[PDB]
Amino acid sequence: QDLTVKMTDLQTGKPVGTIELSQNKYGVGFIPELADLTPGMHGFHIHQNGSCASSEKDGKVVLGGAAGGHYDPEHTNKHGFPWTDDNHKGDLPALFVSANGLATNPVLAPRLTLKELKGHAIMIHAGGDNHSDMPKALGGGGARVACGVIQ
Amino acid sequence: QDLTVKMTDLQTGKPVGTIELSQNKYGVGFIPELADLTPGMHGFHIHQNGSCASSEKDGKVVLGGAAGGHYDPEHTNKHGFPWTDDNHKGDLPALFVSANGLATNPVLAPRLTLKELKGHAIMIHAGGDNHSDMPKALGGGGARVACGVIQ
Ligand SMILES: [Cu+2]
Ligand SMILES: [Cu+2]
Ligand SMILES: [Zn+2]
Ligand SMILES: [Zn+2]
């Protein structure tokens, strides 16, 4: 009922820490213990496929692309807040990284259950997340910088 | 059912923006539109008294002290997470301020209802919030840097 998730830097292939997932009566808590990340807010979402391998897009390599799109069991095909229902159920609150490159601020996803996360990937993006597909799709998260699979 | 909250810098007495509170089926959403704040994570809590005036502590002035301690209707007398019940019900997720001094990342408090917040003050601290009374009390938020009352 409680699984630690190893996270790997997609560019370097080097481990950057772990993320602990806990079920509580309000949702799933995500407690990071990561390092070597660029300071600031990062797009943070659960993804469809249970893989962190790369994919291919029109001739270019997509790091962590094998994970697929954002977890969306309701097939909303929209990106939004962690507290709104008509958008990817995998949309999590943005993840904060200190000036020292560390991420330790815990975060909650009220619409998720721990059980449904098994076999899915957790992704950390380079850009932020304004919880909209505007001006940039998927909240402007951009490239995927860190990933881990939830066994 | 939806009230905009004007926030004031305690040191300068100058307005720093507003914070919109919205009730959703998962809790109370807090959407900031503030400026002139020091970059980084800030302690963010709802306080007991409906005032942002100063107070007095053993001969020294306490900016925003009139607001009293953290909202704690269950009298837990402990500081913790926004998703744990045996701690101040007024404990909110930390607030992020960009390098440009702006705060725009929305935040959720699942244990609160919009109705119960009327007449209370929202406080923003200088330090962060590790959601514990250790090593520093109240999460290490420290001095109060910005405040507003929820009419
Ligand atoms: Cu993502
Ligand atoms: Cu406070
Ligand atoms: Zn999404
Ligand atoms: Zn507290």
From Swiss-Prot, chains A, B:
One of its GO terms (cellular component) is periplasmic space. NCBIfam families: PRK10290.1 (NF007628). The keyword Transferase does not apply. It catalyses: 2 superoxide + 2 H(+) = H2O2 + O2. Belongs to the Cu-Zn superoxide dismutase family. Disulfide bonds join 52-147. This is Superoxide dismutase [Cu-Zn]. The gene is sodC.
